[PDB]
């Protein structure tokens, strides 16, 4: 039993809800919140901009030190950093950004990072300003993640479309 509430069960291990991941994280304080990161950990907009703003820019300060030490992530890769006031940990995961021309096949590699964590609160990777089809992202999630994933979908219209079309 965990503290996640109001989710629709899609499969044995994948759940979905119309929710703002920022507000959901603040309420649940999950062990792991997933950020929709870029390789530079520049948290300017989309989910990343919202998560960072909620940390009062502490996420960005920590991230800049991480990049100064380690260099950029790989597309499809991840790193574990602090969850600040939102979660114990933040798993920064880089899905391909279609608006940059990145290979959509890397979306599966991106979701594989979730399997290193028993339970996660997450957005759909590569959705939103990353330009991928969210229906495809949900399919890859379900077919790749084996650990327990709680998906927060901000847009109510998109959430209903994702549910109604789920096979
Ligand atoms: C937004 C659209 Br159109 C479709 C993608 C989507 O639902 N992305 C998200 N999913 C969950 N929490 C979220 N918080 C914020 C700020 C975003 C962007 C977000
Ligand atoms: Cl985004």
UniProtKB/Swiss-Prot annotation:
Q: Which organism is it from?
A: Severe acute respiratory syndrome coronavirus 2
Catalysed reaction(s) here are: Thiol-dependent hydrolysis of ester, thioester, amide, peptide and isopeptide bonds formed by the C-terminal Gly of ubiquitin (a 76-residue protein attached to proteins as an intracellular targeting signal)
Quaternary structure? Answer: May form homohexamers. Interacts with N protein.
Q: How does this chain sit within the bilayer?
A: Multi-pass membrane protein
Domain Macro, which positions?
1-167
Name of the protein in question = Papain-like protease nsp3
Q: Which residues of the full protein are shown?
A: 1025 to 1191 of 7096
Q: What does this protein do?
A: Responsible for the cleavages located at the N-terminus of the replicase polyprotein. Participates together with nsp4 in the assembly of virally-induced cytoplasmic double-membrane vesicles necessary for viral replication. Antagonizes innate immune induction of type I interferon by blocking the phosphorylation, dimerization and subsequent nuclear translocation of host IRF3. Also prevents host NF-kappa-B signaling. In addition, PL-PRO possesses a deubiquitinating/deISGylating activity and processes both 'Lys-48'- and 'Lys-63'-linked polyubiquitin chains from cellular substrates.
Q: What regulates the activity here?
A: Inhibited in vitro by GRL-0617.
Q: Where in the cell is it found?
A: Host endoplasmic reticulum membrane
């Amino acid at each position: 039993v965990n503290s996640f509430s109001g989710y629709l069960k899609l499969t044995d291990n994948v759940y979905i809800k119309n929710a703002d991941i920022v507000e959901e994280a603040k309420k649940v304080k999950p062990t792991v919140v997933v950020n929709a990161a870029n390789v530079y950990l520049k948290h300017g907009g989309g989910v990343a901009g919202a998560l960072n703003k909620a940390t009062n820019n502490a996420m960005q300060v920590e991230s800049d030190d991480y990049i100064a030490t380690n260099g950029p992530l790989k597309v499809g890769g991840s790193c574990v950093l602090s969850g600040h006031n939102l979660a114990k940990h933040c798993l920064h995961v880089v899905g391909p950004n279609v608006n940059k021309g990145e290979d959509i096949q890397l979306l599966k590699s991106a979701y594989e990072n979730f399997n290193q964590h028993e339970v996660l609160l997450a957005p759909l990777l590569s959705a939103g300003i990353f330009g991928a089809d969210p229906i495809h992202s949900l399919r890859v999630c379900v077919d790749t993640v084996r650990t327990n994933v709680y998906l927060a979908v901000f847009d109510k219209n998109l959430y209903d479309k994702l549910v109604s079309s789920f096979l």
